[PDB]
Each structure stands twice: as structure tokens, then as C-alpha cells.
From a paper:
The β-glycosidase from the fall armyworm Spodoptera frugiperda (Sfβgly) is an extensively studied member of glycoside hydrolase family 1 (GH1) and is an attractive template from which to gain insight on how to rationally design more efficient enzymes. The Sfβgly catalytic mechanism relies on a pair of glutamates, the proton donor E187 and the nucleophile E399, which are responsible for glycosidic bond cleavage in a double substitution mechanism. In addition to residues involved in catalysis, the active site is also composed of two sets of residues involved in the substrate binding: the highly conserved residues in the glycone-binding site (GBS) interact to the substrate glycone through hydrogen bonds and stacking interactions, while residues lining the less-conserved aglycone-binding site (ABS) modulate the Sfβgly transglycosilase activity and its preference for alkyl or glucose moieties. Sfβgly presents the typical (β/α)8 barrel fold seen for GH1 enzymes.
To obtain diffraction-quality crystals, the full-length recombinant wild-type Sfβgly lacking the signal peptide (residues 21–509) was expressed as a secreted protein in P. pastoris and purified by ion-exchange chromatography. Sfβgly crystals belong to space group P1, with 6 molecules (chains A-F) in the asymmetric unit. Although chains A, B and C present the best quality parameters, the six chains are very similar, as seen by their structural alignment and RMSD values for aligned atoms (ranging from 0.084 to 0.192 Å). The recombinant expression of Sfβgly in P. pastoris yielded a protein glycosylated at N206. We were able to model two NAG moieties at this position in chains A, B and D and only one NAG at this position in chains C, E and F, for a total of nine NAG residues. Sfβgly chains A-B, C-D and E-F form dimers in which the monomers are related by non-crystallographic pseudo-twofold symmetry. The refined Sfβgly structure presents a Tris molecule, a known β-glycosidase competitive inhibitor bound at its active site. The oxygen atoms of the carboxylate groups in the side chains of catalytic glutamates E399 and E187 are 3.9 to 4.8 Å apart from each other (as expected for retaining β-glycosidases) and hydrogen bond the Tris molecule complexed at the active site. The highly conserved glycone-binding site (GBS) is composed of residues Q39, H142, N186, W444, E451 and W452 (red), which hydrogen bond hydroxyl groups from the substrate monosaccharide and are located at the bottom of the active site (red). The aglycone-binding site (ABS) is composed of residues E190, E194, K201, W371 and M453 (blue), which are located at the entrance (top opening) of the active site (blue).
Residue numbers in the entry:
A (entry chain A), B (entry chain B): 22 to 509
Amino acid sequence: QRRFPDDFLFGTATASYQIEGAWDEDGKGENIWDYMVHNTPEVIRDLSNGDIAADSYHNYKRDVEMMRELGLDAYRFSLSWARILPTGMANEVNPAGIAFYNNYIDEMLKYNITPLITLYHWDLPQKLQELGGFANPLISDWFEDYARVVFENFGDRVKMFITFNEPREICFEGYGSATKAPILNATAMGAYLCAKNLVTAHAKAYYLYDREFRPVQGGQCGITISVNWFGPATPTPEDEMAAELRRQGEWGIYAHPIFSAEGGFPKELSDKIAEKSAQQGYPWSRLPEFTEEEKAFVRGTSDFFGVNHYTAFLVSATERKGPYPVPSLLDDVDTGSWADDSWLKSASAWLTLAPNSIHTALTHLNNLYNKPVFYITENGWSTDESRENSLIDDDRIQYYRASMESLLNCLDDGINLKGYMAWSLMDNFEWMEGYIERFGLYEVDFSDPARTRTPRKAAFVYKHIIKHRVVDYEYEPETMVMTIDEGH
Amino acid sequence: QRRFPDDFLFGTATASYQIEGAWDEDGKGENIWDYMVHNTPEVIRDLSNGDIAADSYHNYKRDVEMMRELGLDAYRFSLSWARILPTGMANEVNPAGIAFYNNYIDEMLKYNITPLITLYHWDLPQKLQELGGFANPLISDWFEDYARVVFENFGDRVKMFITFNEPREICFEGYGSATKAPILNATAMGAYLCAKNLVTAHAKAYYLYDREFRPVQGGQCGITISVNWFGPATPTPEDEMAAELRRQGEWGIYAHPIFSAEGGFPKELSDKIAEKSAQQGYPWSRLPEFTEEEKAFVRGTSDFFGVNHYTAFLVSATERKGPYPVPSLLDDVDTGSWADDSWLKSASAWLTLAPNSIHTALTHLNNLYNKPVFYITENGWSTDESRENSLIDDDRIQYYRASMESLLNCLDDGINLKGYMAWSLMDNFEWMEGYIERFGLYEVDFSDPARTRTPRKAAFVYKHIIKHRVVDYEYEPETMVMTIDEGH
Ligand SMILES: *[C@@H]1O[C@H](CO)[C@@H](O[C@@H]2O[C@H](CO)[C@@H](O)[C@H](O)[C@H]2NC(C)=O)[C@H](O)[C@H]1NC(C)=O
Ligand SMILES: *[C@@H]1O[C@H](CO)[C@@H](O[C@@H]2O[C@H](CO)[C@@H](O)[C@H](O)[C@H]2NC(C)=O)[C@H](O)[C@H]1NC(C)=O
């Protein structure tokens, strides 16, 4: 039997806007999601919002009770910048926001669950957005100041910080298009400008931690990037090339500056954007090139490579290029992309069960970026909220076991992989998709004001994998009621 | 009797959004006023907008005919950034946009009227505002690119450029509160952030002009700043000190970096902000102090001091302090201000006929900033739309004649004043006041599709002053019909 080492960290992950609720309580400022869903509710598919969500603001002791039921080693959550600094700036630190996170953290440590904190998981204060947000290079400073408040208030107890979660979803989807707040839809340059400012913010936050808190606190600071596998649709030179560009456009622009030896943006995509910008009449490249000291400043600034990974894609230089805006990043990249029709489908169009996809992605990164320290910070499966017998999720179980096998392949290739976090502990507000797509190991009842969390079959399977450290394909729980085991 | 020398440039001024109309014609992009008024029309007192305005886009030939009738030496108008560059960036230069400004200009020159062009008079493309506008340091570079296009296209014929009209109205009113688009109301630091970015954009446009255009074109590049006189309410050290600080807050903040010997922001106001910011718990000052390199970059970057001046105010250290937001610019300044109640009142609350105010403001500047070249780029009087017999404007006559006397006092004092531009050639969209407050020498019928222009009595008085170069207090126009005197 292949076995997970005892020290391998199993957890789950959530994000503040998706679970907390209490959106205008105890002095919390308005964020870009609050702003969007209140002004244009129609952008959410089921017309719902995160005003209450899973109400973790009030129900955090139950959340920890659920982590214990699972036997988790660690839990990854995010901090709401506007709950902590309602104006966005560090002149006003909200003590109710700080008390809550201290309460949640302290509850975790009481039962020996390791906290992993993400500083930014998509909920910028609306007041900062008014000033340009991630399009404004001053975001580096605002973020540095926020990171100080976070490290000094929580760093005594929390030893693993993530600056940003999924830059692509921040930059491309939020600034370069209309699929995430703040739906700026600045297709020509938004994504690239955001990219540059975000990785510079990261770097500043990193040097702060390294300079002013690491010596006393002894933790680590990193970043998480979404790295799905993108491979060539046909084993052809032109599709090998298309896939390479697609990777650079999907995650290379964010990872390269931080994790490459030389720094800056990926070279191939950079030349193609430059060519495109000139043909289009811009007196410079829509992709701002790094100066040599900017490259130096940003590279080397991560203690680990956090990887959010779900799936795989086939990429074609010619086929099935859905009409993209011009100019735009996906037009710059110039490729079509899709799932193999045989791969198991979830309730989310982009999400399929691609066999061994974690191992494929990490092997590529491990060779490309000089064998860094890896954590899988998100991986999971969506099911439709309308499903009959929604607590019985054999498809989710299938997906988790396949991810586990792929994690075990990574370990027997000597990839320095230290942990896995399932997305998500419980159902939550799934951005533009609202409550239609459910990722929880625990189901939440969003009609019920107590927001009762009930374990799905897969919660028991994950519990079983964590405890036994192997995947037993014959395991099915006899009872669907959770207990906490001894020592947890 | 005193006399204006023959070389004195008499003209009038207008701004693009206030007169042009054609707000979405011929590829023109959305600007911040289009956006504000179409999304929240109620912010305009009379529920008006500039969709059509005086329709100068179509009526420009009649506009020039009106300059001829007045016998103007010169005409100051603004260029619409979004009409020229619909996306805000220099990739697409809108040909119908350029053609319109080339037609307007070539018509002025055909009848020997000198064009003075303002690059920015408050109509930022909405696409650039989405990225933060003047809150975003990258505005410097966007503006420089826009300026290149302006100097390239029009500098062969236009030898006088003004970068920005009235930085206070842009920054304080627009970003620091809710009285101008884009009504961001970022009271704590919006004004100060904008201030820094605007004087930096100015300086870049200036060095661009100086290096790449001036040697061939032989023109000048300047800025216009609103400098109303602010004097002490009582002859007291406390009210002297209050008046100085108020001057620094209203205009010094914008003028000092560009026009003083040392550069940077004014010292007294800066220490005051740093003190307030410290006791408000900010980790730095809300006024970003210039580095030594920044101070040298921005200082010395104007060929003349364009002055918008209308009136004067009395200032107290203790009395009549309106309710100011905390933090804010007026709260940092911490003064009360009001017009002397004995002065003649116009249809605008802020605007009174303060006797000899031009001379008082300019004398102060002349001594403060070492004898620069001055133009009065705006000066004028407001009357109510509803006024009975709106073509008879003896109060306007009084204002203008007092202004002429004040200019002659300046010339007699040896102040290097080169010209005067009356606001405005015609009635136009008066921002938040719509068409309620009328400033025109010519009245416009805004319910008429042809937007007929008809001269007020004041048009005949101004025409007389330009012809004979003296103020005749006994002169009263014979006719209400206007003609072009030969030689014009
Ligand atoms: C976001 O911006 C894009 C690009 O400006 C818009 O997409 C286009 O709009 C027209 C009209 O709908 C389409 O026919 C074109 O295919 C697109 N234009 C270009 C230049 O590629 C899109 O509509 C905007 N989205 C939202 C939600 O406002
Ligand atoms: C712009 O911001 C100002 C300053 O915050 C707002 O003025 C006040 O509004 C709040 C309401 O929460 C009051 O409690 C304060 O007392 C007000 N300040 C003053 C000086 O009276 C104002 O509401 C905002 N303007 C908008 C949104 O148009």
C-alpha cells in the first residue's frame, strides 16, 4: 500500500467573503463584492449574495468543531481587509474585526489545528477600488501597510501566510474582464497592469515579513497561484507551442516574476504581446516590461509555491477559439481550450476529472522553477444544489481519490509537496455562480438562519484518508453522523 | 485716461464639455461627465446635461463669427481627450475628432484670431477613470501620450498651450469631495493624491513640449490656476496666518510645486497636514512630501502663469467655519471664509464683485513667484436664467468695467500681464448648476434646436473696450444688432 507520510498536512480551505456573512456588522467597511452585488445583483446567476453566506462570523466555533470531526491537521482561511481596515488604510484598525480573527485562530489552536492565513482572497475595500485598486501602483503601499497590521496582530500564533490567492482571478477576471468583481472589463491593459502591481505588492509584503517579523516569529510567507494543466490538443509542434503560450497567459505571468531565476514576465508571451500592441498602434507594449531592478526586487520573494489545482485542458492553436475581445489577453495568446469529452463532468463547466492532473502540473512546475516547496492550497469538486440525495456524492469521492493517487505519484518522484487542502470545508457563496454550485465536504442549508452544516459522504471518506493515510477503495461509512475521535 | 497697449490680447474662453455637444458622435468615447449625468442625473440642479449644450460641434463657424463681431484678438478653448482618444490611450486616434479641431482652428486663423488651447478642462475619458484617473500615478504617462498627440497635430498652428485648467476644481472638488465629476468624495486624501499626480503630469507634458516641439514650433506651454484673493478678515496676526494657510490650500498646493524656487508643496500647510495626520493615527502624512528629485522635476515647468480669477474672500482663524469632514483639506486648513457682504452679488453664491481683486491677487503672486508672465485666462459674471430682460446686463457691465480698471492698475504697477480672456463667449453648461447660471457675453436659447446665439448688452461694451482700448463709462450701445467692423 502506498502511504502518506505522517507529517504530510491535510486540511480544508475557505475565503472570507464566501463564508463570513456579517457584511456590515461591527464597523466592517464595504468591499468590492458588497458593492457589486448590491448595485448590480443580476451579475450573480441565482441573484444571491454573501450578506449572510454561511454566517461563519457568528458560527466559527462550529466550523472548528467540523475541522475536528474531520481530524484535520490544518485549516486555510482568509482575512477580510475591510473588516480589519474599513477605510482600506491603517489609520483605523477595527477592534471587532481583529477580535473575531483572534477568536477563530485561538479556537483552532485549542484543538491543535494549524492556521494558514491568506491576506487577500478577492475582497478589496471599495474605497481602494474608487482609487483604481490593483490598477493603481500605490496598491503596493496600501497592501504593505495592511500586511503589517496582519503580521503584528496574528503572527505570534500563525506561522504560514499567503499574500494573494489566485492572481489570474483577481487580474484577468476582475480587471481584464467581467467575470469577477470589480468587473472593470478593461480588456486591453487591465490584466497586465494588475499583474505587475500585484506581484510588486506581494514582494513588498514578503520583504516586510522577512525583515521585520520572521526573525521574531519564525514563520513563512508565500503566494498561491492557480495552476491547472494545459496540454496540447494534438501532439503537433503548433499545439505544443499554443499550450506553452496558454500556460504563460494563464499562470506564467504571475508565477514567472516571483519564481524564475531571471524574473520578469515569460519571454515568449511577452514578445507576442509586444508584436500585437505595435500592429494595434500602441506606442509601447500593453505588457509593461520589468526594468532590471524590478526583476531583482520581485524574484526570490516566496518561501513556497502554493498551487490551486483542479483540472486539465486541451489547447489548440486553431480549433474552438471562442470569440475573444480585441485587444485582450486571450486574443494575445490566440488559442482554443477545452476538456476531453470523456473526463467526468462536475456542476462547473470548466471543472472535469482529469486523471493524474495534479502530478502533471506539478512535474512541469517542479522542473521549470528549480524544485520549490509546494502546497496544494485548493482542490475539489462541485455538485448541483438541485441534486437528489445531495449528501451522497460518489462523484466527489471519485474525484478526491484520484487527487490522492496523484499526490502519491508526486511524492514517489521526490517532489517537495508538503500539504493538501480540500476546497471546501462547507458550501459557501461561489462568486458569480452563487449557491448553485456546491463544493462543501459539509452541506450548508442557506434557507435556515442557523445555516446548519451537515456532512456529505465525502467528508467521511476524507476523514478516513486522513486517519489511515491510505486510499481504501472499499471504504464507505456505515453511519452519516460525525464524531470526534480521541486526541482530536 | 488710461489705455491698454495695442499688444494686449483680449479674448474669451470656453471649455469642450460646456459647449460642444455631440457627446457620442463620430467615435467619441465616454467621459466622466457623460457618465455622471447619465447614471445619476439628479446631481445637476436643473436635471440638465451637456449631451447637446450649445452644439458647437456643429455650430463652430457661427462661434467664430461671434469672435469677429466682438473683434477678439484671441480665443481660449479646450480639447476633449475622449473625442481625440476614445479609449484614453494613443493607439486609436479618432480622425473625425482631429478634423473637428482642425476645422475650428483653421476658421479662427482665417479671420486672424489666435487660438489658445487647453489640453484638459475636466473631461477625463471614463475608461481612464475606471483605472483610478488622477488618483493613479500612471495618469502622468497617459497624459504625456495624449499631449504628444495634441502637440503633433495642432502645434504647427497653435503657439499657446495650457495643460490643465484649475487643478483645485479637478482634485479637491472632484476627488476630494462631491461637487465635480467624478464625485469620488475621498475626503481624507483624494485631493492630495490628485495634486501630486496632476503637477507631475503637467511637468511631463512640459518637458515633452520643450524638447520635441518647441524648437520647431516656437510656442509656449503653461498651466492655469484659480487664484481668487483670500485676505484676512481682521487686521490681526491670527487672521493673517489664517489667510496664508487658506491661500496655500486653495491654490498654493498646485502652484508652489511648479512656480516656486524650491518646489514641493507649501511648507506651512504641509506641517499642518503632517500634524493632523499624525494625531489621526495615519502612519505617514496624508500629504505625500516630495523627494528632492521630484521637487526639481516639477519646478520651473511653466512658461507662464495662467490665472483664473473672479473674486475675493475674507478669512478668519476662528469665525464661521463651515462644517468640514474629518479628515479633509478644509479641516486641515481650519479656517472660515466668506465674501464681504457689502459687495455686489451675482447669481452664483461664491461670486461677488470684489473691487480691484485682480490687482490684489496678481500683486501677491508677482512678489511670491519672482515676476513671471501672467495671463488672465478666465474672469466673468453670472446672471439668472429666469431674469426678466436677460439681454440687459448692467451688473455684468459693472463687473467687466471694474475688471478692466484692475488690469490697468496691474499694467501701471509693471506686472507683466499679457492678456485677458472673458468667461464666457456664450452661455454654456455650467457643470452642477446646468443652465441656471448664465455667464455668456452671448445668450444661448437652449430650448431651440439651432441653439441661437444673441448678443447681450455686455457684448457691445466689451467690443468697445477692445476697439478703443479704454473704459468709457458714458458709452452705451446704440444698437442690439451686431456687425463685423472691417479689418476683422
Ligand atoms: C467588455 O468589453 C468588451 C470589449 O470591449 C465587449 O465586447 C465587445 O462588444 C461588442 C458589442 O457587444 C462585440 O460585438 C465585440 O465582439 C466586442 N468588441 C471587441 C472590440 O472585441 C463587451 O461587451 C464588454 N462586456 C461588458 C459586460 O460590458
Ligand atoms: C461624502 O463624504 C462626506 C464626509 O464623510 C459625507 O458627509 C457626512 O456623511 C456622514 C454620513 O455617514 C455623516 O455622519 C457626517 O456627519 C457627514 N459629514 C459632514 C461634514 O457633514 C457625505 O455623506 C458624502 N457625500 C456623498 C456620498 O455624496
